[PDB]
Write a structure and sequence with these properties.
Four copies of one chain form a homotetramer.
Chain A: E1 8-12, H1 17-28, E2 32-37, H2 40-49, E3 53-57, H3 63-77, E4 82-85, H4 101-129, E5 132-136, H5 140-143, H6 149-169, E6 175-181, H7 187-193, H8 199-208, H9 218-230, E7 239-242
Parallel strand pairs in A: 1-2, 1-4, 2-3, 4-5, 5-6, 6-7
Helix pairs in contact in A: 1-9, 3-4, 4-6, 7-8
The complex binds nicotinamide-adenine-dinucleotide (4 copies), chloride ion (CL) (4 copies) and sodium ion (4 copies).
Residues 47, 50-51, 53-54 of chain B line the site of one sodium ion.
Amino acid sequence: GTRYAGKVVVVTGGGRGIGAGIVRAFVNSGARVVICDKDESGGRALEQELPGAVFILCDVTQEDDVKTLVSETIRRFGRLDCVVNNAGHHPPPQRPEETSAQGFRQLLELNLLGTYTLTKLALPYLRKSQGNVINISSLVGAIGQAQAVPYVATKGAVTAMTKALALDESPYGVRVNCISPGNIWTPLWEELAALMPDPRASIREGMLAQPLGRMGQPAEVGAAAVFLASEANFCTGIELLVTGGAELGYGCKASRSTPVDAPDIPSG
Amino acid sequence: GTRYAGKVVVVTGGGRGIGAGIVRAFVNSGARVVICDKDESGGRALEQELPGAVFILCDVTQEDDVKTLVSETIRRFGRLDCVVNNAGHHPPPQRPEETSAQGFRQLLELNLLGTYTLTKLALPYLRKSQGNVINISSLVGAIGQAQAVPYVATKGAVTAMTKALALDESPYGVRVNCISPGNIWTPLWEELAALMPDPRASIREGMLAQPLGRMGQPAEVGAAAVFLASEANFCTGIELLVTGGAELGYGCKASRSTPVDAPDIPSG
Amino acid sequence: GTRYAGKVVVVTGGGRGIGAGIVRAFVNSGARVVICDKDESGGRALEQELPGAVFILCDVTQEDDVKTLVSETIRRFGRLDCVVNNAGHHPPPQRPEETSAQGFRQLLELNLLGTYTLTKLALPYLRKSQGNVINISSLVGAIGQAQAVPYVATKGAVTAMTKALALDESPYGVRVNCISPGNIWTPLWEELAALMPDPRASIREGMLAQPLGRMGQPAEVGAAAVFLASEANFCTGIELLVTGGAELGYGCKASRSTPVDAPDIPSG
Amino acid sequence: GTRYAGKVVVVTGGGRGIGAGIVRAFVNSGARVVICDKDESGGRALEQELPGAVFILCDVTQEDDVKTLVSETIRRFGRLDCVVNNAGHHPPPQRPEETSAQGFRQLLELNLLGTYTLTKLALPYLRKSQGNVINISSLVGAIGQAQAVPYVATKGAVTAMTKALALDESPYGVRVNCISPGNIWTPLWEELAALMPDPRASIREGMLAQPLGRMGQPAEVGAAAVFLASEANFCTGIELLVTGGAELGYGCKASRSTPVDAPDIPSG
Ligand SMILES: NC(=O)c1ccc[n+]([C@@H]2O[C@H](COP(=O)([O-])OP(=O)(O)OC[C@H]3O[C@@H](n4cnc5c(N)ncnc54)[C@H](O)[C@@H]3O)[C@@H](O)[C@H]2O)c1
Ligand SMILES: NC(=O)c1ccc[n+]([C@@H]2O[C@H](COP(=O)([O-])OP(=O)(O)OC[C@H]3O[C@@H](n4cnc5c(N)ncnc54)[C@H](O)[C@@H]3O)[C@@H](O)[C@H]2O)c1
Ligand SMILES: NC(=O)c1ccc[n+]([C@@H]2O[C@H](COP(=O)([O-])OP(=O)(O)OC[C@H]3O[C@@H](n4cnc5c(N)ncnc54)[C@H](O)[C@@H]3O)[C@@H](O)[C@H]2O)c1
Ligand SMILES: NC(=O)c1ccc[n+]([C@@H]2O[C@H](COP(=O)([O-])OP(=O)(O)OC[C@H]3O[C@@H](n4cnc5c(N)ncnc54)[C@H](O)[C@@H]3O)[C@@H](O)[C@H]2O)c1
Ligand SMILES: [Cl-]
Ligand SMILES: [Cl-]
Ligand SMILES: [Cl-]
Ligand SMILES: [Cl-]
Ligand code: NA
Ligand code: NA
Ligand code: NA
Ligand code: NA
């Protein structure tokens, strides 16, 4: 209710999904939240519903949109306490030979360099408030994912960059942390499933990937983000897993295209 | 204020240090807290100061003390929602040849088997409440520590056991997580430093081990424990680092007894 | 052929399975190998087949057997260069309420304290040869396993203890490393599968747990052990995974007893 | 001597440093080695000294140089068994505000997209030989480094991409692994130290960062690469640390610009 009262927070990609869940969580903790999104529709709907959230149209791949975002946040609200780098994209499944260097560069511009550019421009103000940075990475940056080489690379970069930033900003008392969600039910997840030959079977496989037996919710990532900003004052450079246990224990991993022998020859 | 209202929580070793910090954090979130400690002095002082905390004398190495602890918690309060396994001990620095199998067994009884015994007896009740378990492990279970072979082994065991329990209890919706603190200023830390030839130099080295430049506080571990119990509903089997960044980046590691060559022969 | 020529190596549990694979790998690299095993049958068969391997009856849970093992190795061969702590046991599947503190203590005596006791007694001689220690841990010490709380705890302890020993022994130039195998087809694996209601289905599930689509071989762990001893002179405190990729990517983890909802409610 | 006999290996950046160490290690194991380097001087010197190593001028940031590299390797030698992606660069120390998006993009082109482009073009041939890929990442991709945000991001990307590739290529039996070196004494390390106000003090700090008390050698990375290619047939997606223990235990991390209080206030 007052956990982060009067702090100014920027959330990129805050118009839907996990970002909207983070926006709602910070508004509920008393913050002024600047929603950054390339999509006017969801950001305007959130700005009208939530007093304390304002919407600024901004594409994080455009350096001038981000400079204006930071410039307007300071002009209109006088300070900056927390940046949540959430804007990102997961392409449909793609084998390595179905990827291009150009597609990889485009994904790096959004998932990695948008996060880098806003952080860099925000740091002079975060240093003045002893604020903090939260990056939304992914579990698959840590354990890999099939048919997702460009995406996995961008999220490994984000998690590592979080630790480098944590070391660079610790002399100012500025913390830098990341959240690595596993499977979270969002519009992105729904849109990816809808491209599969059996969307609900794909969703069910997504649920069975967790020992808890379900996907996570945006509100659960949101609560983790408010914790990191407002109560984790001795945490920096950590990777907070919000994954339902998906990384634990053995599971069925050998793919449908993978030659697997009968169990009378178990080790080749 | 109401984050964990009416939940029943048992905290072992809750009489001082990190455990007292966890006790205070759960009381402040509205829980009924059962303080388990072998030391009557600190537990009675907390029980008298905090309404909502009660003290039950209990040595977690004694199976009968733990059975009575659980039996009395259910008889007096009717449910059990959260177990925090915090009771533990760090011996003074000891080289491997200065350790004994008997000392190692004694430390396993406290740091590992006390945690196992209470968890096992608590599980039938935690399953009924869809409660959760929080184990207090240590960063050095993950990265090692010099002159601490028995201690490091016990904490590696706790962190791993947390993941095994998370897998076993997920069909009941019971989450099992651990917190791995780094250097936290507690009476244990002060007592260990007081055995060194220069206690304040040792404390200063303990502070410089973190990029943040200080040790953590019990209240910071307490906030992380309340987060795990009350708001991390999609987290299970995670290791929440509360370390000030001590695991990040390069640091000075070659010991004072270690032959290090002059910098004209950098790689032997 | 000459990678580890004339070095003296002790392998505990070397009579069958992974230990026999390590024994054969070190003999093939030119070492004198002392097979330690509580079972005379396999050790005698290996000692007669392999010149350069000798067998010494030894139960690593008995401090006097281990002291005699070390005493006889030095008396008969004059030096000690490498200790491989491989002797260990995996109990059948057991839920937490089906485990006992006494069973847990017995498993700690073998999987953890046998490794500790031999290492401690070997260290004075390893320091003189700048030798090294290799511990055989398990992937599940890192990621957990269902129905295996005591076993998982012992292997988390071994992996952590490896790092503590690495720090303590680095001033002497003595390296301490561990190998964490995943599913390796051994007599232990076969005996555990034979206790299941459908042994070959269990073996097939064990094979499908790896992206590579098979279990590993003892000879593959053996090659990793010879690498660590003979060519990894800048590695200490590492955990060398020999797992077929089992820790990578998403897999089916929600258990058969776990309530999982239909895919029209993906996140509860 | 014959560990990898007749296999065809491409090593990018093989003209000096770690790459030259890998080249020599694969030549010594009997392979045909194609040295890829943008620098003619070192590659020609190695090609003339080592029969079995040939040099092909190639800048991995230029897609046409890489296509020609692969085309010429197959035309001249008929197969491809192993790709070692070693070409990379570490910029001088730079604070985040001293970095540019353009510099970051240039570093991604070399450290990440050069590795991606060659792997993608090599995969059709590696699938036919059941070959393997080895990426040279860095420890700091896992633990972060100060004053190196772009570099750390590129190496986090490489390590993660290694795991994604391992999952995608396991149905073909093609393994993909990475080596994460810590401090290795190379010409790059010497050139970076020479930019410091006290180069030998910087080198000495680099040596003290390891419990072993020295930096590693290119030949030690080379031995690890030959192990991964020739004897680690059950390893895929692993990160093989060649770091001297730098990630273990506590060290001095609070920087010279970091406010650290006197030891009478240890936790703020
Ligand atoms: N959903 C999951 O399971 C999952 C798992 C792991 C990580 N993540 C990460 O979480 C983040 C959010 O994922 P989501 O599932 O909520 O996605 P989403 O597609 O549902 O929402 C993403 C939002 O970001 C905005 N956005 C996209 N490109 C932008 C740009 N150039 N500039 C500004 N805004 C932009 C979109 O308009 C949208 O409002 C991403 O970084 C994603 O990689 C998601
Ligand atoms: N202080 C640190 O820097 C640090 C770092 C990492 C982990 N930890 C862990 O945090 C936990 C608490 O540490 P602390 O620093 O607060 O220690 P502490 O000594 O200050 O407090 C520990 C409490 O546990 C109680 N206790 C000890 N043995 C007991 C037993 N047999 N039965 C019941 N209660 C018992 C003690 O009486 C005391 O009240 C331990 O598990 C410790 O290993 C501490
Ligand atoms: N097989 C796997 O999939 C797997 C996976 C991960 C780890 N491991 C570990 O690898 C090691 C070997 O496993 P395995 O599968 O080859 O087992 P195994 O049962 O096939 O062989 C173990 C050997 O150790 C000996 N041994 C047991 N108790 C002993 C004692 N008290 N003193 C001396 N020798 C003793 C046995 O007699 C036997 O010869 C163990 O530490 C095990 O936990 C195995
Ligand atoms: N030296 C260390 O301590 C260290 C630590 C961790 C990781 N690494 C990594 O190891 C690898 C080698 O490092 P090093 O220390 O041996 O470096 P180095 O500078 O000594 O050698 C690198 C070689 O790569 C070549 N190269 C550079 N750009 C190229 C391009 N565009 N196309 C083709 N070849 C190119 C250079 O000409 C040179 O021959 C790098 O990927 C580096 O990031 C090094
Ligand atoms: Cl996957
Ligand atoms: Cl230490
Ligand atoms: Cl499992
Ligand atoms: Cl650093
Ligand atoms: Na508004
Ligand atoms: Na009270
Ligand atoms: Na013999
Ligand atoms: Na040549």
